[PDB]
Amino acid sequence: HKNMYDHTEITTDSLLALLGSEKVKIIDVRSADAYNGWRMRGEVRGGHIKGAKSLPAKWLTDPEWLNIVRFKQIRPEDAIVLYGYTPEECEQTATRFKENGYNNVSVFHRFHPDWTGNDAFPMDRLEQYNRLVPAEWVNGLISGEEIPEYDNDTFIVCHAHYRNRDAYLSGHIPGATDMDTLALESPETWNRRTPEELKKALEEHGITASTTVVLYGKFMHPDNADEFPGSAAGHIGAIRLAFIMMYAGVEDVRVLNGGYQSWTDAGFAISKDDVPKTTVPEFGAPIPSRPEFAVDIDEAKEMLQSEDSDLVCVRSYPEYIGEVSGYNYIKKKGRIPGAIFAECGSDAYHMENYRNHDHTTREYHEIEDIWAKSGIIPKKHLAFYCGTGWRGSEAWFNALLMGWPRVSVYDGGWFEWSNDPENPYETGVPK
Ligand SMILES: C[N+](C)(C)[C@@H](Cc1cnc[nH]1)C(=O)O
Ligand SMILES: [Cl-]
Ligand SMILES: [Cl-]
Numbered sequence: 001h002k003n004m005y006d007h008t009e010i011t012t013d014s015l016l017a018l019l020g021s022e023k024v025k026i027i028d029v030r031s032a033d034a035y036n037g038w039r040m041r042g043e044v045r046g047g048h049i050k051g052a053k054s055l056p057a058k059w060l061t062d063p064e065w066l067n068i069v070r071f072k073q074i075r076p077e078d079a080i081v082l083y084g085y086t087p088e089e090c091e092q093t094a095t096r097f098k099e100n101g102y103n104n105v106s107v108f109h110r111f112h113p114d115w116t117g118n119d120a121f122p123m124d125r126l127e128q129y130n131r132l133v134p135a136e137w138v139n140g141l142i143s144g145e146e147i148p149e150y151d152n153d154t155f156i157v158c159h160a161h162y163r164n165r166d167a168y169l170s171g172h173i174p175g176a177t178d179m180d181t182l183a184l185e186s187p188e189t190w191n192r193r194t195p196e197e198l199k200k201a202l203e204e205h206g207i208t209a210s211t212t213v214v215l216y217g218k219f220m221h222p223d224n225a226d227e228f229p230g231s232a233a234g235h236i237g238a239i240r241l242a243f244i245m246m247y248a249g250v251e252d253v254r255v256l257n258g259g260y261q262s263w264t265d266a267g268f269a270i271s272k273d274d275v276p277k278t279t280v281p282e283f284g285a286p287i288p289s290r291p292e293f294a295v296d297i298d299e300a301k302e303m304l305q306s307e308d309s310d311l312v313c314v315r316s317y318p319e320y321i322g323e324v325s326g327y328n329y330i331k332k333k334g335r336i337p338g339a340i341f342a343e344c345g346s347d348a349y350h351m352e353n354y355r356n357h358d359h360t361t362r363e364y365h366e367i368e369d370i371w372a373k374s375g376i377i378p379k380k381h382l383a384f385y386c387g388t389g390w391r392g393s394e395a396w397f398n399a400l401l402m403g404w405p406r407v408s409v410y411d412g413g414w415f416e417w418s419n420d421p422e423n424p425y426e427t428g429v430p431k
């Protein structure tokens with residue numbers, strides 16, 4: 001007897017006995033930030049039930065909801081167990097599953113505070129989740145409110161963009177200032193600038209080594225027909241700048257999960273003031289403080305020959321096989337020989353395979369499992385790269401969030417590699 005609106009409750013004892021069953025899918029309908037580890041209700045242990053998948057209830061309004069569920073390999077023959085902070089949060093999702101051919105759907109009522117409140121119930125979390133902050137956390141930061149995972153007294157919220165101040169002026173987080181990606185990267189090499197330039201740029205934007213920097217960008221639908229599609233991939237540029245700042249030596253860098261979209265989806269107020277910058281005289285630390293984060297072409301070539309290391313190609317498949325260069329300013333087409341392929345998504349200005357539809361980072365278990373299928377594992381020294389280092393930065397940031405101990409970005413990427421005609425390259429569908 002199937003009931004569309006009254007859902008069977010599964011008990012704690014029943015759920016414990018089902019932990020590790022291959023026919024059970026445990027589904028966490030809270031926000032992705034709570035899933036990652038943020039203790040959004042003040043619970044003592046944050047994260048998700050061990051083995052649970054993430055399906056935020058907010059996605060019920062996505063017309064591709066069923067395609068998401070199927071992409072996550074959640075099948076009708078599976079027993080589905082939903083949980084949230086409350087059982088009431090799961091009722092609409094439970095009904096939606098039943099409306100789409102899923103007949104075995106249950107709701108677990110005792111995740112919080114029963115499961116979160118007992119040491120014997122297993123939970124998982126993203127090891128460095130506090131670097132990927134929710135919109136509620138940023139709102140508390142700028143409001144002077146008491147927030148977890150913050151012990152500083154100096155902060156700056158930074159809106160990233162590529163030569164497009166309209167992305168900032170058309171709507172930004174209150175109090176935030178804008179940072180053009182050209183402030184930290186050079187248009188001649190599309191690599192990070194020299195230490196002396198980075199020191200001046202950071203100071204002029206009001207950033208010291210001991211300043212908590214919160215970075216975000218605005219997605220504005222990049223179109224390859226425009227001259228600068230990167231001006232619309234604002235949140236990749238935010239993560240690009242987060243990489244450069246962490247390389248330079250800013251001790252505490254956070255990224256707003258999902259960028260501007262998360263701020264408006266949370267319903268917070270937005271400002272259009274052109275906030276003047278409050279400069280600081282001294283960055284206060286040698287640049288770079290974390291040089292291991294950045295890999296150049298000589299070290300990258302050594303990594304291609306080392307048993308201990310690997311380059312990770314975070315480009316699209318058309319770029320990989322040499323159909324296109326991916327950019328209107330690169331004529332050479334092909335791939336670096338010996339790199340491990342980890343497809344970014346559709347083109348150079350999208351990161352579909354590393355993101356959800358709302359631009360938050362994809363469930364990290366899925367990324368880790370895909371990576372491990374290709375030999376991309378934390379025991380190696382990995383240098384993520386792409387065209388110019390933007391997409392490689394976002395992949396690098398994801399591995400950083402998992403706590404991987406030796407991950408870097410090969411800054412030069414295909415742009416630098418193909419600019420030397422003596423560098424070997426492959427083309428065509430791999431054989
Ligand atoms: C280095 N710029 C900003 C010129 C790149 C950045 C980039 C975006 N997606 C891949 N690379 C661009 O916009 O083509
Ligand atoms: Cl399971
Ligand atoms: Cl953390």
Ligand SMILES: [Cl-]
Nearest residue numbers: 136137147148
């Ligand atoms: Cl919070």
Ligand SMILES: [Cl-]
Nearest residue numbers: 226227228229
């Ligand atoms: Cl443009």
Ligand SMILES: [Cl-]
Nearest residue numbers: 164220231232
């Ligand atoms: Cl634009």
Ligand SMILES: [Cl-]
Nearest residue numbers: 233234235236
């Ligand atoms: Cl983006």
Ligand SMILES: [Cl-]
Nearest residue numbers: 313335336414
């Ligand atoms: Cl490549």
Ligand SMILES: [Cl-]
Nearest residue numbers: 404405406407
């Ligand atoms: Cl690392």
Ligand SMILES: [Mg+2]
Nearest residue numbers: 190388389411
């Ligand atoms: Mg570069």
Ligand code: NI
Nearest residue numbers: 304305306309
């Ligand atoms: Ni190798």
